[PDB]
Amino acid sequence: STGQHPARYPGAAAGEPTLDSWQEPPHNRWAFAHLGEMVPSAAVSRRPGHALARLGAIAAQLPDLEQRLEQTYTDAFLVLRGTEVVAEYYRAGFAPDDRHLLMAVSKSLCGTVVGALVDEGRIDPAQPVTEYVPELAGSVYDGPSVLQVLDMQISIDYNEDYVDPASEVQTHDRSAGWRTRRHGDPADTYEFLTTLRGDGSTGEFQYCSANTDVLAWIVERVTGLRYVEALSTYLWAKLDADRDATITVDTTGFGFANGGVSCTARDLARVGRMMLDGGVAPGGRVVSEDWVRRVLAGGSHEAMTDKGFTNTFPDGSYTRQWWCTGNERGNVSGIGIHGQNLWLDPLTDSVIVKLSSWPDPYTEHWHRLQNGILLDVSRALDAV
Amino acid sequence: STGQHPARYPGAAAGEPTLDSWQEPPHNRWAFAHLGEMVPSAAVSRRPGHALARLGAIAAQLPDLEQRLEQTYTDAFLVLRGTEVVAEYYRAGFAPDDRHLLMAVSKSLCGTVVGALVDEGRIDPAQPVTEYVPELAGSVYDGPSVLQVLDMQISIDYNEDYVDPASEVQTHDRSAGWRTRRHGDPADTYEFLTTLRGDGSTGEFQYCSANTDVLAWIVERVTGLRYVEALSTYLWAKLDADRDATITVDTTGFGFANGGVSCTARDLARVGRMMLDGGVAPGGRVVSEDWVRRVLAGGSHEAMTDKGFTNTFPDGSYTRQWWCTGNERGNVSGIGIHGQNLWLDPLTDSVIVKLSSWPDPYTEHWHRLQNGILLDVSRALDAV
Ligand SMILES: NCCCCCC(=O)NCCCCCC(=O)O
Ligand SMILES: NCCCCCC(=O)NCCCCCC(=O)O
Numbered sequence: 001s002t003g004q005h006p007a008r009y010p011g012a013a014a015g016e017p018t019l020d021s022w023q024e025p026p027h028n029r030w031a032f033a034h035l036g037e038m039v040p041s042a043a044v045s046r047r048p049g050h051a052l053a054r055l056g057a058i059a060a061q062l063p064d065l066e067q068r069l070e071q072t073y074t075d076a077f078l079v080l081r082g083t084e085v086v087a088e089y090y091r092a093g094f095a096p097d098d099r100h101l102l103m104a105v106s107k108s109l110c111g112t113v114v115g116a117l118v119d120e121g122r123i124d125p126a127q128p129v130t131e132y133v134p135e136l137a138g139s140v141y142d143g144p145s146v147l148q149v150l151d152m153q154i155s156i157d158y159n160e161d162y163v164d165p166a167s168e169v170q171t172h173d174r175s176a177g178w179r180t181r182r183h184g185d186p187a188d189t190y191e192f193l194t195t196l197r198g199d200g201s202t203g204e205f206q207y208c209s210a211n212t213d214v215l216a217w218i219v220e221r222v223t224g225l226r227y228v229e230a231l232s233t234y235l236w237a238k239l240d241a242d243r244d245a246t247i248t249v250d251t252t253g254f255g256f257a258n259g260g261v262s263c264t265a266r267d268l269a270r271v272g273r274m275m276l277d278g279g280v281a282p283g284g285r286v287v288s289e290d291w292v293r294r295v296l297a298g299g300s301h302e303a304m305t306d307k308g309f310t311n312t313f314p315d316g317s318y319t320r321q322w323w324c325t326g327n328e329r330g331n332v333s334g335i336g337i338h339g340q341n342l343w344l345d346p347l348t349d350s351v352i353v354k355l356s357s358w359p360d361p362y363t364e365h366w367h368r369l370q371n372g373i374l375l376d377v378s379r380a381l382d383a384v
Numbered sequence: 385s386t387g388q389h390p391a392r393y394p395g396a397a398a399g400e401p402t403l404d405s406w407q408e409p410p411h412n413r414w415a416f417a418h419l420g421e422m423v424p425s426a427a428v429s430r431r432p433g434h435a436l437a438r439l440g441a442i443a444a445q446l447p448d449l450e451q452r453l454e455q456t457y458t459d460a461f462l463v464l465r466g467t468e469v470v471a472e473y474y475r476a477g478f479a480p481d482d483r484h485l486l487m488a489v490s491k492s493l494c495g496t497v498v499g500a501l502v503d504e505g506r507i508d509p510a511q512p513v514t515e516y517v518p519e520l521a522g523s524v525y526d527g528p529s530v531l532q533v534l535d536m537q538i539s540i541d542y543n544e545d546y547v548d549p550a551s552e553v554q555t556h557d558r559s560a561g562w563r564t565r566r567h568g569d570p571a572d573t574y575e576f577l578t579t580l581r582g583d584g585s586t587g588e589f590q591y592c593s594a595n596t597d598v599l600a601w602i603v604e605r606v607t608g609l610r611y612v613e614a615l616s617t618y619l620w621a622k623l624d625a626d627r628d629a630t631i632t633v634d635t636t637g638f639g640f641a642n643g644g645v646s647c648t649a650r651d652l653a654r655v656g657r658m659m660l661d662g663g664v665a666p667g668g669r670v671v672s673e674d675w676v677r678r679v680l681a682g683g684s685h686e687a688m689t690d691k692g693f694t695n696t697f698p699d700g701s702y703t704r705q706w707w708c709t710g711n712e713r714g715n716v717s718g719i720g721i722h723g724q725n726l727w728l729d730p731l732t733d734s735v736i737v738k739l740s741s742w743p744d745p746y747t748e749h750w751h752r753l754q755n756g757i758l759l760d761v762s763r764a765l766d767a768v
Contacts, residue, residue, distance in 0.1 A: 019564050023546075025743035028722060032485040032741050033459065033478060034426070035646055036630060039561055042421045042639065044629035044647075045616040048667060075417065094417060101416040162407075177423055180403050232429040245428035246420060255426065262419055263428075283432060338412060357416050359409035 002190035003135040006226040008037075008253040015252055037249055052090045059087075061380040065373075072339055072369050075100055076265035076355040080273060081348060081381060085266070099246060099262040100355040103336025106247075106261040107212045109235060109271065111150060111321025114215050115287040116234040122222045125150065132218045135190075140198035141214055148202050149211045149218075150320050151299050155201040158208050162337060162361035168196075172209060176250040178260075188252045189213055205303045205318055209258040212321065216257035227255040238283030239274065241267040259336065265353045272342050272351030291320070296332055296346065298324035308364060312371055329378060337361035343374045348381035386574035387519040390610040392421075392637040399636055421633055436474045443471075445764040449757075456723055456753050459484055460649035460739040464657060465732060465765060469650070483630060483646040484739040487720025490631075490645040491596045493619060493655065495534060495705025498599050499671040500618040506606045509534065516602045519574075524582035525598055532586050533595045533602075534704050535683050539585040542592050546721060546745035552580075556593060560634040562644075572636045573597055589687045589702055593642040596705065600641035611639040622667030623658065625651040643720065649737045656726050656735030675704070680716055680730065682708035692748060696755055713762060721745035727758045732765035 008016060009030035017027035022038050031038055053066050058079065062068075066089065069077055075094050079087040090096055102109075117123045123132070125147035130137050132146070144154045159167040173179040175192035186192035196210055216227040223230050228247055236245055245267065248260035255261075274280065275295070279287040299319030309316050315326030325331040334342035339356025352374055358366045392400060393414035401411035406422050415422055437450050442463065446452075450473065453461055459478050463471040474480055486493075501507045507516070509531035514521050516530070528538045543551040557563040559576035570576035580594055600611040607614050612631055620629055629651065632644035639645075658664065659679070663671040683703030693700050699710030709715040718726035723740025736758055742750045 019562075023562075023745075025741075028743075029457070029459070029741040032722070032739075033482055035485050035632060035644075036420055037424055037426045039632045039644075040421055040424060041630045041632045041644075041646075042418070042612040042637070044612060044620045044631055044645070046620060046623070046625040046628050046651075048617075048621040073413070075413070098417055101419050178403075178407075228426040228428060233432075236428045236430060237432040239430070241430040244430050246425045247428055248419060248423045248425045253426070260419075260423075260425075261428070262425075267430075338416070355416075357409075357413040359412075361407075 001135065002188075002194060003133070004221075005190065005252060005254070006220050006224060006229075008226070018251065037253065049092060051092045052088065052096065054088045056087045058377060058380040062376055065377075068369075068373055072354075072366065072373065073357045073359070074339070074354060075357055076353065078265040078269055078353045079377060079381070080269040080351040080353075082350075083273070085269075086381075087377075088265075090265075096266070097243065097264055099243065099264055101259075101336075101340075102261045102263065102268070102334075102355070103259045103338060103340050104209065104212075105268070105334035105336040105340045105342050106257060106259050107209075107321040108334030108342060109231065109261060110212050110215050110219075110257040112271070112287055113219055113230055113234045114146075114150065115291040115320065117219065117222055119285075119288040119291065123218065129214060129218065132221045133214070136194060136214070139194050140196045141193070143200065144202055146215075146218065149214055151303070152205055152207055152211055152318055153203050153303055154198065154208070154211065155204065155206055156196055156198040156208050156210065158196060158210055160207055160209060169209065172258075176254075176256050176260075177248065178256065189250050189254050189256070190217060190252070193217065203303060204305055205299075207306070207318075212258035213254075213256070215321075216255060220254075226253060227257055228253070231255065231257075231261075235271070235286055238281040238286050239267065239270040240282040241270060243267060265355055268342055268353045268355075269351045272344055272353070275344060276346060276349055276351065295320050295322050295324075296330060296344075298326055298332075301326065308367065312367065327375075329375075331375070331378065333374070339366060339370055341370065341374060343378075345378040345381065348378065350378070350381050352377055385519065386572075386578060387517070388605075389574065389636060389638070390604050390608060390613075392610070402635065421637065433476060435476045436472065436480065438472045440471045442761060442764040446760055449761075452753075452757055456738075456750065456757065457741045457743070458723070458738060459741055460737065462649040462653055462737045463761060463765070464653040464735040464737075466734075467657070469653075470765075471761075472649075474649075480650070481627065481648055483627065483648055485643075485720075485724075486645045486647065486652070486718075486739070487643045487722060487724050488593065488596075489652070489718035489720040489724045489726050490641060490643050491593075491705040492718030492726060493615065493645060494596050494599050494603075494641040496655070496671055497603055497614055497618045498530075498534065499675040499704065501603065501606055503669075503672040503675065507602065513598060513602065516605045517598070520578060520598070523578050524580045525577070527584065528586055530599075530602065533598055535687070536589055536591055536595055536702055537587050537687055538582065538592070538595065539588065539590055540580055540582040540592050540594065542580060542594055544591055544593060553593065556642075560638075560640050560644075561632065562640065573634050573638050573640070574601060574636070577601065587687060588689055589683075591690070591702075596642035597638075597640070599705075600639060604638075610637060611641055612637070615639065615641075615645075619655070619670055622665040622670050623651065623654040624666040625654060627651060649739055652726055652737045652739075653735045656728055656737070659728060660730060660733055660735065679704050679706050679708075680714060680728075682710055682716075685710065692751065696751065711759075713759075715759070715762065717758070723750060723754055725754065725758060727762075729762040729765065732762065734762070734765050736761055
């Protein structure tokens, strides 16, 4: 048993509706207005073939930039300097206002929602996860603090290998509806989380996508809101975004917080703009100045033992669902597999969004190229 | 084997991607921009509780209208007289720009796409279905003409009972992803259609949702477009709609043409406006004047033996995916279960959209109430 969860609609029974019940009352009043939450669905365009390249000023300093974007399978690229869009690129077949899957850049959005609730005093990071989700007793999340979840500092038997069919990541995907269920699989994400185990140690960085879904579960328990609604109320609805974002949901309606958000490049940049504005957005304060400052400051360097990340960023770290380079520019980034970045360059007051589709989830090859582009673009924004 | 189908994206292999392959190249470039087509997904609102009632002029003639709308579980109601919205109602919790499932009003949209292709000379209604879909040989659709599909005049062993778990409608739903698959179920909608049988007779009306999906299959074979794209290119993109529509898709990406479209009430009214404008929309001609005239003229009365429909509309009929009342006003309507109507009142140059969620799919009770409202509203628009 995973305890109380936010109803899909007001008054809904646990787990209702399902794929087999949404046409029945009382579910159908909700389902007929939200069918994409139940059944895969395609857009029928209201609008009746070539890449759009407006790389602007930075083009002079980076003449081959468009080629480098093509080489890294770039779908959308946008640079916001201050409040101004100063460079844009969209591949052939991808419109400026099309949405793109964020993968684990989604985690940085979830951390932001958690931060908002910390500012309200509804979450204390020092408290154990079980203070908010008692049902995680007996799991690897029995003992660790919420901050250790936020900082990915829990040792977990979870193989985060995105191409291994035997890995826990694929079981995670199957539990959440990203892959086809196997017999005996957990029924939903909450159940999957309760199955996770570890040796009990904490304090060393281990990237684990399950951690973010635990954060989303905590958000639900503290607010009583579906994570989908909490993500809107505490973040998205304050951005003055052009479009709604979307998030994949599992069979209970639980949003896939660790990887399942999609949005436009321009709208994602608004999240970066909020961070560089000390936590304030057009619709109000999203998180405290202190929270933003702690993100920019980084996590414990000694906890960060990931050789791949530190080979590129020796003084790098991770905190509050953000990767921190610890480089001379103080760059921090949300990062997702296949080449998604929400990259912050505080020195130039700039945000870089890059949304891509590398053939591979993550290799040193793509990592080197991607970071080379983001760093070069950042430096191109420097006063000369 | 069901033959050639439009690829989900340019160059895609048959049936690709699946739920298990969309993260792999080359599929992921497409999937990351269209994930809602693969995995159920929720909107994260960019906007930060009471019914909106603007029933306007007709309120004086129908003082109790709002109550009657509540009694029939109305979610959205809109009256367009000429080019002007003259009355609107939206229930608490449903915004004016929210989309709503159309159920079989979707069929009237599909018929419109077929009509466009007839005008282009790419479909001849007199030709057998097998002229366009040879793979339907050996099925109940081997022999009948395309027009007989359009007019629902084929005898089929298909129990269109929406609450019977043993009915062909539920098998249809399971094949298309509206319900959970059972072992041994057809893999997709195309396969399901090939399993249908009948005694071979034609000429009498039998409402069968499978007919519309055969029409959509024909559309795909003649255009080479996914039905989702054909619905946009030939109809939706010419309407100057406020929002995209959506349509549920099965595991091959085939749109559920018989029932799966969702859109806003105001945008649906644009379809009615196009019909009353002789087939022309803001973005160009959608169908010929002749096609519209034949819809308004009705089908063969003698074919219409459905006692429920004819008890209300004695001179009623059905043609080209529209229900024709044959009443003194010449009303014609798209109709969907649980209370969806795209209702045309040519006398007053008006369109009535009513989108609802009756607890039951279809009963004489709801039928009587729904039609009573539409007729009363139509008459309230008359010159006095
Ligand atoms: N299957 C659910 C998980 C989907 C999100 C995974 C993801 O995007 N992970 C990002 C890993 C970034 C690693 C950065 C680095 O090592 O340098
Ligand atoms: N399960 C797929 C079918 C969903 C659409 C069915 C539908 O909306 N049918 C409309 C029936 C209208 C009957 C009108 C009458 O008999 O008066």
